[PDB]
Symmetry: C5
């Protein structure tokens, strides 16, 4: 497999046209305003730390590494590992899947404890119904890695409208120098630009690449659950592939 | 569990980066305007008192003690309770849980009136289907503690747009003094700043920390429902902890 | 069923903290603008009469009487009714309930014609499956009373933005007088204030006390639908109260 | 059966307060801008003609004839024809229901092809399973008549932001004339008013009169789906009327 | 079948009314701004590559060939193919469809492999149970081609508010020249016009002609799933079209 380069070139080339459109006009020393980086970056992170427990914000902020360097699941191997379990259950039975739990526990953590329940002797109606309520609450841990980045997309630009009115009321209070209305409005217009740079170029794409990586990795886990229901029913090994290549949209020769 | 310090440091360090950006430019004597605190705070909590019955607004406002000092339910004891109920039903039967009702009422009141129905001898199809509906209306109790703070977050800044114009119309009435437009536009802009200090830093984090505390305390309530369905069917103690450590994602040796 | 003063003191104390901030500014006659009360109120209510049929708007505006003077259903008599029907079914059977149909028809209209369908002898799969459809289409009588005040809350402020652009253009047409730019910008700024004082301080709380009046008066109907399915099956009276006190969070001594 | 006069006097009285408010301050010739009707009315009708197939827009833009002159289904006859079909069924069986299919096909096009299937002898589990799917995809014919006016309402004003900025950039590029900012800002402020007079007072009411004309025309269809299932099973004529007056909310003697 | 000329003539006629309003008040040499077509067109297309994997964005950005040149499925053949299978399945059995799969695979790729499962002998409780789940994941390939153009519809005008604020600050930094505010404010107001020209007249229709083209192509896929279930049960060819014309809304002679 390889790495999806869609998000690196998507944010590097979004911060490189925001950085060239500055160099095309003035310089890059006017747009650096340090006491207004903390009110949007340091403020939008801390005010969004209180919107979640401490454990769901430490994950959701350290979950960029699943946006930038994400590797899509090889679907031609999701099928092959189903026909590898299927033939194994018909060749050596179902009780001989215990020495291979750790092999499928490296494929994904849900196929590994769904075969452990298969060897322990639990009927499918209690495996397809416990591992379906475990997967729906495994993605609720992935929907909390997004709800952070859907909150930073809402708190970064809404903390610039704070860093502006804080830096705009201070200028109107004095207003005595007539040359303090020009530069005093630009410094108060940067804290908004940082709110629109980070929310649109950085925090919305990561809030979505974290969603298209959930709906894609849940879709593979929602296929293992349907095969295990058809693995223990003794279905033909060549039919659990054929019922998955159709289910995923993959061509098979 | 100790506590979730993700919201005390989340709302203080947001109100402490706001109070710095004010002290860096000037003094905070310019941003204190008392007759514009009683519209954003006094109004935003007055109109939001009318949006809910009185018993559902006194709860929603006093539901801050659940946002700030919240301690998440430890999933290592949500399991060691089901492993403690199951053996007490497998050893001494189901009718020997009368002496443990008030003790199983202390963990959570749902397991307390779900074993009381279990000892009376009501079939699982009712206790499983009543505690499913008793939870959905114990959930509408917590979704109103959040529906308040998602309404103050919509009325704190929307009573600033009223507190602005009420003080922005009088500035246009008497436009004789040329120096009455400077500070008059500053005072009429503070009542908008007070609306974004509260909606963004205080009312949205509490309208969410009360939601990530609902969805977590429901999953612990939802498992006790699924776990008792396995207790009246006479299952093993270790076959329900395994189906509940997988339904949560907890490690077991 | 005593009184809910949550909406009376919720709007009067919001129309006062507004009316105080206008009197503190110095004058109230500067905020009274008669040819702009007919465009925000006369427009927002007429342009929202066409968004509904005639009987869903006349009924939905006379539903402001259910926001102010609303009395929540006492959940200690929803229980003492179910324990009074089941105690009457176990004593006199079903056929001896003809003399009490009008008695329950005063509690709520659904229990009166859900016992009529019960006395007639219709199978429970048609009594429960119809009342679940009578109620599901009894909320569309209540979710319209909300959909009006949620359509007015979106048309009251967006019909003042028309009241502005009509008075903000007449001022820009005739700029010969420099004394018509100050007071002309205020009069065109009042119809924007009327748009936010009504929509956000009066028309949203009446749109939300009507939503918590539905969700609470449906929870009561959703029990009689269940408290009858358990009553015809010949269950004990003290069980249908125990299973209904738990679907409500009410204590039983 | 009369016609709903809730929209023909609801919008005509909305366009009569937006036109009286104009004639109070000045004249109407100041607001007539012909080369700006073609961006708001000519553009938002074209830019929303491309958002739908050519046949889903001719239906959606010709749905004003069903928003203005709509006559609500009288539920005092939906019940009388339900007890008329059953009394026609219990009298002469289900096969002799063919000499009236052309009579019930005139009531509504769904009761005509649901009785035509009732004569052909299809099982009642299928005449209801296709009709529930013939209806759920008969709303997608009605919800596409609504999705146009919920797309025009979002493209009438958002095409005023274009007609403004097109007429505001040409004024700034030619700011030599000092008297060109008085009328040049008014004429550029009308295309935003034409986008709020149509989207808010003409296309949002029709987008919500076609939604309340759907839910009241599906409620009658959805009752015929249940009244044909309770007729093949051979229920009394008096019960299918009693279960349908309670399913609609109509009083019976 | 033909080409839907609703988007190739309804967008071009909506890109001229945005272009004839420009040629009426001046020239286009004032609304052409090269260093600003790279922040909205070059930026919003790069900052929306990062929101999707590299394969789900190329699919959606190349899915305009489905908006402009789309061919509505002739529902008078969706019903004439069902009658072509049922008359061939009843005459020559189910097993004799092998010689005509590649024909039914060119109608649509879902009926071609749903018959391939029908010939292998899979029970309909796994064919319809797969082809209903193989269709729910055939939408996410179409629901992304929509989800891309609803993201460019929200990132084209969000990069205009960036291109403005970058072009509005470089003006306020250097405001010594009194003639540098006019032509400087117009150029900083074009980068916003370039956003609402594309996000409105180009990206909202393609995001909605891709949504009304999905609902029609998933409608035909859903009817095949409801016909094949009626084929394996061996229903008459005249009773599967009878339930497919009604399920589709088509007239049959």
């Amino acid at each position: 497999v390889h790495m999806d380069v869609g998000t690196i070139i998507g944010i590097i080339a979004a911060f490189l046209l925001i950085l060239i459109s500055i160099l095309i006009g003035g310089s890059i020393t006017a747009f650096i305003n340090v006491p207004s980086i903390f009110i949007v970056v340091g403020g939008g992170m801390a005010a969004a730390m209180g919107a979640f427990p401490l454990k769901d914000f430490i994950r959701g902020v350290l979950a960029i590494k699943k946006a930038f360097l994400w590797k899509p699941p090889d679907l031609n191997d999701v099928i092959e590992t189903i026909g590898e379990i299927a033939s194994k259950v018909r060749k050596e039975g179902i009780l001989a899947l215990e020495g291979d739990i750790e092999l499928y526990y490296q494929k994904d953590p849900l196929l590994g404890d769904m075969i452990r329940m298969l060897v322990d002797g639990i009927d499918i109606n209690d495996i397809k119904a416990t591992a379906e309520m475990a997967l729906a609450q495994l993605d609720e841990k992935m929907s909390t890695e997004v709800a952070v980045w859907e909150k930073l997309a809402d708190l970064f630009p809404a903390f610039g409208m704070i860093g502006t009115l804080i830096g705009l009321i201070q200028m109107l209070r004095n207003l005595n120098d007539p040359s303090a209305l020009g530069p005093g409005m630009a410094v108060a217009l940067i804290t908004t630009l940082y709110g629109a740079i980070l929310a649109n170029a950085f925090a919305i794409p990561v809030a979505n690449k974290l969603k298209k990586a959930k709906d894609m990795e849940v879709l593979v886990k929602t296929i293992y659950i349907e095969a295990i229901e058809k693995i223990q029913k003794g279905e033909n090994p060549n039919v659990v592939k054929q019922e998955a290549a159709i289910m995923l949209g993959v061509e098979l020769p």
